[PDB]
């Protein structure tokens, strides 16, 4: 129950060299429950 709001900000967070401070977690062992945050850093066990 709620709403989502989004607006484009190409004019404020782009920079010509590309902005690299933005991050996300692509590799993760388990799916998080709703309303959770994961700021820890650990090496991904991709293989054996």
């Amino acid at each position, epitope marked *: 129950t709620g709403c989502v709001i989004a607006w484009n900000s*190409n*004019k404020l967070d782009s920079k010509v060299g590309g902005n690299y401070n933005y991050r996300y977690r692509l590799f993760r062992k388990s799916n998080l429950k709703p309303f959770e945050r994961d700021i820890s850093t650990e090496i991904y066990q991709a293989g054996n």
Partner: nanobody
Amino acid sequence: QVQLQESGGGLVQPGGSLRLSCTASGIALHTHATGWFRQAPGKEREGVSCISSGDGTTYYEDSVEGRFTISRDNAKNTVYLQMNSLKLEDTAVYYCAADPGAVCHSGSYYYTDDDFYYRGQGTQVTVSS
């Protein structure tokens, strides 16, 4: 009978900064696309920058990248062009213009083709020592 009025310009030292302003009397912003054009003596007129209608992606020319900025204030209905790091070659007159719809770079078109409906008187910007 809509007028577009410009303010700014004058004698500025190279390496200085200026803020040109264009204000629309009849029409309102955030509905048109607003561009700046520049004409030099003995040369043909060339654009400077453009903002489209909705939100407005800022488009710049090849010779003005990284130095000139553009912004649009809908509270005062005024578009602002920020001159930073001026060289010697831009001693010329500037005009502001508007066109209905998002016209700047939608497909294989670009605002170098001067076909805007609303025009302005223009202001003179001069760099000298």
